[PDB]
Amino acid sequence: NFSKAMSVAKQVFNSLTEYIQGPCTGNQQSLAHSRLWDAVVGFLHVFAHMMMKLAQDSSQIELLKELLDLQKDMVVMLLSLLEGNVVNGMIARQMVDMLVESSSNVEMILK
């Protein structure tokens, strides 16, 4: 039943991307001040474990593809928050701090 959740999850992220795509400073700052970082931490944890689990099973190829496209749409949303970013920026620092907390989960997609 993960297909239904991921399909909706792509639309949420894609809609979020359009909010901040176009150097929309207000939406970039407001989302930074919100609790979006905590949502990504859970998703990265879900992405990390399901990446290895579904890879091991040969019957999960279709679901594994559905997992990747959702994951790519997340980083586009992250890259959309760094449009027009400055050094030591508030949005940039919060993104780095979120990266440190999920470092265990972050350093498993790369492998």
Contact in structure between 69 and 10 (CB atoms under 8 Å): yes
In terms of Cα–Cα distance, which of 35, 101, 46, 38 is closest to 70?
Answer: 46
CA-to-CA distance for 64 and 78, rounded, in angstroms?
22
Contact in structure between 29 and 90 (CB atoms under 8 Å): yes
Asked whether residue 101 is marked as a ligand-binding residue, the answer is no
Contact in structure between 36 and 94 (CB atoms under 8 Å): no
